[PDB]
Amino acid sequence: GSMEWKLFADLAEVAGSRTVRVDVDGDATVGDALDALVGAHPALESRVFGDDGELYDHINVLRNGEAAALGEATAAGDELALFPPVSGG
Ligand SMILES: [Mg+2]
Ligand SMILES: [Mg+2]
Numbered sequence: 001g002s003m004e005w006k007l008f009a010d011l012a013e014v015a016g017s018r019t020v021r022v023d024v025d026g027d028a029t030v031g032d033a034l035d036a037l038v039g040a041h042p043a044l045e046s047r048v049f050g051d052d053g054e055l056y057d058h059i060n061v062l063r064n065g066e067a068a069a070l071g072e073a074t075a076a077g078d079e080l081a082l083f084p085p086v087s088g089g
Contacts, residue, residue, distance in 0.1 A: 001026065001076025005037045010084045011048075015041040024074065030063055031055075031070030033080060047084070058085045
């Protein structure tokens with residue numbers, strides 16, 4: 001199904017977009033949807049994933065308003081969000 005990522009702060013700046021539509025498999029996880037996002041906007045890759053290819057602990061991923069693990073299922077119509085940590089103390 002199709003779903004959309006909303007990007008904020010530094011991540012929206014790096015991607016050059018505040019909203020990205022992705023179309024993933026019916027059994028796609030949030031992690032699969034995240035890989036689709038990065039494929040569309042590869043500049044995000046260094047900000048989202050560590051050297052090990054794992055999501056950084058300090059990146060906040062939401063699915064429909066709630067904290068989401070990358071293993072969570074998705075559904076057509078989902079609104080996913082990525083928030084970075086703030087730069088200030
Ligand atoms: Mg990398
Ligand atoms: Mg390495």
